[PDB]
Input
Amino acid sequence: HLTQDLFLPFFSNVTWFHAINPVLPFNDGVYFASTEKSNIIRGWIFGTTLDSKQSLLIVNNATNVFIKVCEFSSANNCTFEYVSQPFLMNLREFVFKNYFKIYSKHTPFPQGFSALEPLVDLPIGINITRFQTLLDYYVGYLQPRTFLLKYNENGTITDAVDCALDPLS
Amino acid sequence: SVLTQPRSVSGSPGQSVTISCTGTSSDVGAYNYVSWYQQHPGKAPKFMIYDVDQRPSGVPDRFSGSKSGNTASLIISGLQAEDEADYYCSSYAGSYIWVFGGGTQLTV
Amino acid sequence: VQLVESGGSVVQPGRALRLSCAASGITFSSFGMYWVRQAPGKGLEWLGYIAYDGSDTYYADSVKGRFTISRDNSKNTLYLQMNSLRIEDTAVYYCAKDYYPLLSYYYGLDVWGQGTTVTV
Amino acid sequence: FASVYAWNRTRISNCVADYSVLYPFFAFKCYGVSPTKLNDLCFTNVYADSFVIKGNEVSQIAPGQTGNIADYNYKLGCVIAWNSNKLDSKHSGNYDYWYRLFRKSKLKPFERDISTEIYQANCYFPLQSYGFRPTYGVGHQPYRVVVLSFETVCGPKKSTNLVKNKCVNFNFNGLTGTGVLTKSNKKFLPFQQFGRDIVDTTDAVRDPQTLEILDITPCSF
Ligand SMILES: *[C@@H]1O[C@H](CO)[C@@H](O)[C@H](O)[C@H]1NC(C)=O
Ligand SMILES: *[C@@H]1O[C@H](CO)[C@@H](O)[C@H](O)[C@H]1NC(C)=O
Ligand SMILES: *[C@@H]1O[C@H](CO)[C@@H](O)[C@H](O)[C@H]1NC(C)=O
Ligand SMILES: *[C@@H]1O[C@H](CO)[C@@H](O)[C@H](O)[C@H]1NC(C)=O
Ligand SMILES: *[C@@H]1O[C@H](CO)[C@@H](O)[C@H](O)[C@H]1NC(C)=O
Output
């Protein structure tokens, strides 16, 4: 299948942040990974306002994951609120598009191929211009590129080819 | 729009008589706000029975009554010689307007 | 709250006569007022009512546009301005006080005046 | 049930308006909507006012109505009243329900005022108890009164039965078409909704109520 969407370019440059807390740009998307041992980086906060002037905060606890969209310690307005099982509960890959679509795939930053399966799309209908992780986290960026996705006999993506990488692809 | 009542009602001491006034479903059969008053000659009527089956303070309990359909009736039990008076009934005609019956004379 | 009604007099037909009844105390403004007339040889007839605040005024259709009921909140007195009185409009006029205070209109008359006789 | 003077108003938001659960009722007449089509004709929000009133005051709970309780206790969706003789008419006499008799001003529609003060003119209590008794008549028998307010809460979506091996005109959660449904050996991943062929034509679908993959074959031509 030949798809055209927001994908992370093959052999791109992904920033590497080890913290022992900057505010990063959002652009059109973000690829996030966290291969941290134990539980340290367990949340995110999205919002251009990043103040009371709305913003989306996603906090993951051991028992469950709490997603809230208010104008925040200020629980104002809060037009949306959802809870589900935990995201970050190895390597925890994520993709945050924007309907705020979240993908994920847990696996034991090596070389290899593994596809991300969606978790939840929520119609926040808000502007997302920046984000900051709340606690070994990488932060890629998605770009409008064309891929050649390969589906096996069971419907799972087994391979992909980036059509703008090299002449052979 | 005055509810018709009998001109007079017979009675005797130690007995009971029933005085009734009849109207239509517009007022009698629509709202349960039937009121009865006792009037003596040369004096203003005195309220005895209100809200069909209620009486004001200071009124003897012998003055009572009941209402069914579009007919309102007042029943007096153990009437005395001094209770002989012209009784008139009232009902809510609607639009914050009340009407009174023709007036039934009670005898002894 | 005793009510004393006066102003009854004999006048020619077509004249305007005012019937005023005075209450006892300062409780006239705390309860509504109603007007009732009694023709000779007949029963009692309702003439009209006035709210406790003096704003809501109601009267029967037979007395609509001719009889006006007014009350004084400071002097605790009420008036009944009857206009274009006819020959047949000869009856005893008395004032009645509502059993419940404020605006209820779902109760009988607790206090009744002596009654003023009007003839034409 | 709360008293008529201070009714319990419950708002409805984000609800599946299935009225078949509720619909012997003493009276049931709603205005502004179809009595038999309450699921289709929905509004943004609904408020349900619950109160206990006597049978003789049942006719007073209506738009444009008048009465001792209509103008002073509850002024007026739906007007639902049901018998509660075995539930509220206590043998010793139930006086929990209280009704207002006199008020300074006429009450606004859908407006309630709760107060326990005594009016001073010579002392009068605006609120009076309703003495329901087992020996009382139909008019004096207690009745549970529910008043609904009409102003996002709609009825459940209708569904039909599943027919297989026959040329049907299916509609799977907005995916419409015509074809022959059959059991498919394809193994969908647990997040997928349907399938496509090499020519971008539908070849399967997941039943929204059974979570089974149904192959789709076009009707013969
Ligand atoms: C990543 O950044 C390095 C350091 O500037 C650069 O040499 C390299 O070409 C970049 N790789 C890309 C753009 O794929
Ligand atoms: C809540 O946000 C909406 C836009 O989503 C805005 O119109 C509204 O004024 C806000 N309300 C408050 C109380 O901040
Ligand atoms: C997002 O920003 C644009 C300008 O870049 C503004 O016009 C728009 O109203 C914003 N949208 C929301 C949903 O806040
Ligand atoms: C698909 O899954 C089945 C079991 O459900 C398995 O037998 C088969 O090998 C799988 N196919 C592939 C290509 O992995
Ligand atoms: C849907 O509900 C039916 C009963 O109404 C039940 O048998 C079935 O398992 C349910 N399916 C899902 C996917 O929840």
